[PDB]
Design a protein around this nucleic acid. Structure first.
Lengths: 216, 212
DNA sequence: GCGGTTGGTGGTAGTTACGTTCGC
């Protein structure tokens, strides 16, 4: 199977540097260019540039050459995007992408994409969330995930065994400059006292893992 | 650089409807135009390439047309799973550029929200803050009005709302409204109520509690 | 059979239509 796996995303201060990696597998690496596309939160798509994976020759859009460098390690089937002098406006999910198996005669399109890696450029410090219970023939219950930076947070219920009726809201940015969200689920009121309900919160950026029993 | 403009920027249509999305280029792009579909928290997925070619795996209800500076994506029979943002992209001249995106919402029958209110947890209160949360669950259409009443006085302007993306199966939305007070401010009031107005409700629904 | 989801050699190029592939 053709796949592109990215890594290297994280929080970095303005003026700082990050190196992203795009690990390719399941095809002849040097037969396809590697493209880089970014998407700012709640925004559209912007092509950063590409690199010929045999010649190593990069082509950058706009002004990216001033600050960004594409490179390769063919012995690892990996492409890199080194970013320097990062600005707030560089906050975005970064994707790598490749053309289709057959791209001849102008069949050029982004056929396979990486999963994306989020780059956040901020002067604000990392902070893990506090996790509070939202206590309950249908009862609703949840967890409030309060005061964290940066994105993202993931929430599961009962280690993924409870999926039906789960709603995890998009985070809101508070005046403080911190994010907060809730995750909720609906259950039968009969099951309160029967089934244990645990919300599992993961905030990778701060290495915060919290399990929370939501009791009636 | 070639500017790509889509029209409309957002649309709503019923299951089975024909939907068209237009893409205009700032100069002739020689049929070098692709369409992508992007669902929440996923990478874009190619649907149509080189103006009119349907990608393997993509349902035949998707088609593309156009030439010169004017292009169209047609969805011949819209399905609930087609909730997504659609993007056109030119590859005539570097840098490659995308349109701004068109958000497609799926119409469905009116569905009133189920409303729930949550008092602040003891856990949060012990830290000196109080968040009161109102949940509106599984409604359509998206517009809903939430008022906060604290001892009959309105505090709606002090709250923050978040709305889920449209569900890709049942086409509904959910909404949270959160009103956060200092522990001190919380303790100077008795009745906390959220009052909900929506097209699915003949009269406002209020959920409330008395502090302690 | 014949268009993609694939394999493999060459190679400074989207490199790309081919065959040894894959899948209706």
């Amino acid at each position: 199977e053709v796949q592109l796996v990215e890594s290297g995303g994280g929080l970095v201060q303005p003026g700082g540097s990050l190196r992203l990696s795009c690990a390719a597998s399941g095809y002849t690496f040097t037969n396809y260019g590697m493209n880089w596309v970014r998407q700012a939160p709640g925004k559209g798509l912007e092509w950063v540039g590409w690199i010929n994976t045999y010649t190593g020759e990069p082509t950058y859009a706009a002004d990216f050459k001033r600050r960004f460098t594409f490179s390769l390690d063919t012995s690892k089937s990996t492409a890199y995007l080194q970013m320097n002098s990062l600005r707030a406006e560089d906050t975005a999910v970064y994707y790598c992408a490749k053309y289709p198996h057959y791209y001849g005669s102008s069949h050029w399109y982004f056929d396979v994409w990486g999963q994306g890696t989020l780059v956040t450029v901020s002067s604000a410090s990392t902070k893990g969330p506090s996790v509070f219970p939202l206590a309950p023939g249908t009862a609703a219950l949840g967890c409030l995930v309060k005061d964290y930076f940066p994105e993202p947070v993931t929430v599961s219920w009962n280690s993924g065994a409870l999926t039906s009726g789960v709603h995890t809201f998009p985070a809101v940015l508070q005046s403080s400059g911190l994010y907060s969200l809730s995750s909720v689920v609906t259950v039968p009121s009969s099951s309160l006292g029967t089934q244990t309900y645990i919300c599992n919160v993961n905030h990778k950026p701060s290495n915060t893992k919290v399990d929370k029993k939501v009791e009636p | 650089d070639i500017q790509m403009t889509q029209s409309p920027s957002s649309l709503s249509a019923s299951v089975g409807d024909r939907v068209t999305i237009t893409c205009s280029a700032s100069q002739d792009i020689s049929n070098y135009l692709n369409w992508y579909q992007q669902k929440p928290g996923k990478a874009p997925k190619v649907l149509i390439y080189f103006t009119s070619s349907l990608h393997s795996g993509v349902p035949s209800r998707f088609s593309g047309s156009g030439s010169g500076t004017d292009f169209t994506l047609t969805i011949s029979s819209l399905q609930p799973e087609d909730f997504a943002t659609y993007y056109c992209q030119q590859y005539s001249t570097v840098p490659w550029t995308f349109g701004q995106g068109t958000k497609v919402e799926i119409k469905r029958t009116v569905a009133a929200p189920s409303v729930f209110i949550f008092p602040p947890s003891d856990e949060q209160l012990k830290s000196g803050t109080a968040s009161v949360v109102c949940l509106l669950n599984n409604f359509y259409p998206r517009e809903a009005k939430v008022q906060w009443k604290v001892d009959n006085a309105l505090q709606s302007g002090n709250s923050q709302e978040s709305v889920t993306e449209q569900d890709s199966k049942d086409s509904t939305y959910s909404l949270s409204s959160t009103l956060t007070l200092s522990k001190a401010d919380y303790e100077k009031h008795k009745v906390y109520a959220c009052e909900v107005t929506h097209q699915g409700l003949s009269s406002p629904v209020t959920k409330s509690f008395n502090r302690g």
